[PDB]
């Protein structure tokens, strides 16, 4: 790895600077190196990894969707298809890289429910991103579904219904159900039960945790308002 000669602590520090600078490709490269040191990631460091790749693949996804729509319009020279494939291939590479970090060996070394759920959610997310562009598609969908489901099983056993990672997990699993798995009823069922069970637990929370949970509840709210 190109980051193998840098100290773990220096990589984490520079990942934070990269975030402040909105240099998310640098951020991801630094966090990739941090992961490959072989030591667990703290909660803060898990968020750094997630935010970094969210922004990198996010730009790829938005670019892909622009190109894919233009491509479809021109089917109602090869350059539009060629460039969509270029972005698509670069997007799949990023997803394969994140999934490699998780399988080697973040998930197996996650000796916590909190840490393990976080990584399993990430596994579902980046198989979901591969499914968005897949046309093996069925097999990718099952990999995401399975990663999401195991995270759900653990989260329900080990974490309260207001935990932000659990809420973010159910949010994204509901989106998977709605737009990837062709299961809009599952998506609705999941979003509302998650919302309702979180609201019934808010009375147990501090003003700060309250803010954390209600911020993700708003996203469940907006989706249900769109789907029903």
């Amino acid at each position: 790895g190109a980051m193998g000669s840098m100290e773990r602590a220096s990589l984490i520090q520079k990942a934070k600077l990269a975030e402040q600078a909105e240099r998310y490709e640098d951020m991801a490269a630094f966090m990739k190196g941090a992961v490959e040191k072989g030591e667990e990631l703290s909660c803060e460091e898990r968020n750094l990894l997630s935010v970094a790749y969210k922004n990198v693949v996010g730009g790829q996804r938005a670019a892909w969707r622009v190109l894919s729509s233009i491509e479809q319009k021109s089917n109602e020279g090869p350059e539009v298809r060629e460039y969509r494939e270029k972005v698509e291939t670069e997007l799949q590479g990023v997803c394969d890289t994140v999934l490699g970090l998780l399988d080697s060996h973040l998930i197996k070394e996650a000796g916590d429910a909190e840490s393990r759920v976080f990584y399993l959610k990430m596994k579902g997310d980046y198989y979901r991103y591969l499914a968005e562009v897949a046309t093996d598609k069925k097999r990718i969908i099952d990999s995401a579904r399975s990663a999401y489901q195991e995270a759900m099983d653990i989260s329900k056993k080990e974490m309260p219904p207001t935990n932000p990672i659990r809420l973010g997990l159910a949010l994204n699993f509901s989106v998977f159900h709605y737009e990837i798995a062709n299961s809009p009823e599952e998506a609705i069922s999941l979003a509302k039960t998650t919302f309702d069970e979180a609201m019934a637990d808010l009375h147990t929370l501090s003003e700060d945790s309250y803010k954390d949970s209600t911020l993700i509840m708003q996203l469940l709210r907006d989706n249900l308002t769109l789907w029903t």
Binding site: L171, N172, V175, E179, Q218, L219, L226
Partner: peptide, 8 residues
């Protein structure tokens, strides 16, 4: 466009 956890 629906929200995922990475869009808040």
């Amino acid at each position: 466009r629906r929200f995922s956890a990475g869009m808040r």
